[PDB]
Amino acid sequence: PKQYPIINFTTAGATVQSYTNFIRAVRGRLTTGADVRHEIPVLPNRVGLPINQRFILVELSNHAELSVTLALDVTNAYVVGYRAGNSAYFFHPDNQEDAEAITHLFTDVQNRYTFAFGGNYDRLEQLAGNLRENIELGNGPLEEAISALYYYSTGGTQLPTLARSFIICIQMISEAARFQYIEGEMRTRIRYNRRSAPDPSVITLENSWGRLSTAIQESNQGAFASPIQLQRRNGSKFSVYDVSILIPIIALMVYRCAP
Ligand SMILES: CCc1cccc(C)c1-c1ccc(C(=O)O)s1
Ligand SMILES: [Cl-]
Numbered sequence: 001p002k003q004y005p006i007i008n009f010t011t012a013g014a015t016v017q018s019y020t021n022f023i024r025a026v027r028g029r030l031t032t033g034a035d036v037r038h039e040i041p042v043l044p045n046r047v048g049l050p051i052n053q054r055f056i057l058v059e060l061s062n063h064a065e066l067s068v069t070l071a072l073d074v075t076n077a078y079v080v081g082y083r084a085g086n087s088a089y090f091f092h093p094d095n096q097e098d099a100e101a102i103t104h105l106f107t108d109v110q111n112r113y114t115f116a117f118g119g120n121y122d123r124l125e126q127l128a129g130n131l132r133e134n135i136e137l138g139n140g141p142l143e144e145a146i147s148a149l150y151y152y153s154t155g156g157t158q159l160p161t162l163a164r165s166f167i168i169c170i171q172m173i174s175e176a177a178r179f180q181y182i183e184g185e186m187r188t189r190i191r192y193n194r195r196s197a198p199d200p201s202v203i204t205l206e207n208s209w210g211r212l213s214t215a216i217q218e219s220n221q222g223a224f225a226s227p228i229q230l231q232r233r234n235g236s237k238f239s240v241y242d243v244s245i246l247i248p249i250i251a252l253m254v255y256r257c258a259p
Helices: 016-030 096-102 121-128 139-154 159-178 180-192 200-218
Strands: 006-010 055-061 067-073 078-084 087-090 111-114 223-231 237-242
Touching: 006 016, 016 055, 016 159, 016 180, 055 139, 067 139, 067 159, 078 096, 078 139, 078 159, 087 139, 121 159, 139 159, 159 180, 159 200, 180 200, 200 223
Parallel strands: 006 055, 087 111
Antiparallel strands: 055 067, 067 078, 078 087, 223 237
16 A cells, blocks of 8 residues: 555644645645746646655544545646545546556555546536535535545435535645635635635636646746636636736646746
8 A cells, every 4th residue: 555645634723824834735745846937836747757656645634533535646736536434435537547546545445436527626516516606615614524525435425415525625625735815715714714605716716727837837938928817806807918926826837848
């Protein structure tokens, strides 16, 4: 059983500081920091990456002292599957190289399951019966999401509730690692001790992460060939023409080309 780095977070007594330390620790295991373009770290190139460096693990615990372990791909910071008790569940891999890679995860588990659906928001929202804009985020939702993931192992969680719990976890871990802006959005929810759905500025940043990585890494000294439309909090659109405005906003990029 290959050993991958593990980062722990608990919703029991969660604070702005403890959540910040958590996301910073996840960023630090996802990248080396040796490849930066325009002050923005780039994730490792999937091509030639050894299997022993391919994944990191996030162990989540809640007030009920239930624990689940999420596996994240270091090449895109996204969850590929999770372990709860004696079972492990994996999203349907996009290719045969990824199918072979995930056989090295959670190998001491007695029961291995692969879903027919992938981890993308499009299908998860369909299984959940709700769009991201109608699924509240925060410490309360994460606490419930951890319990739902845990009890799927013994049939006590229905699939729509599982899918919604995946959407909560991916946004509060993967997307917060990718964007300081979203990290700050979860901080506000903890500061107010309030749960709320993400507003259009968050959703469009999530939808644009791949396009933003491409536009930045292809840019002529930071200047984009074509503008990228983003959304304000009130839903209105504005255009981004170069990398500078994004430096405080995006924290990780998928590898698109050599530096
Ligand atoms: C997420 C879009 C974005 C990208 C880069 C820089 C900024 C300031 C932003 C804004 C977030 C919210 C805004 C509002 O409500 O008008 S603009
Ligand atoms: Cl292994």
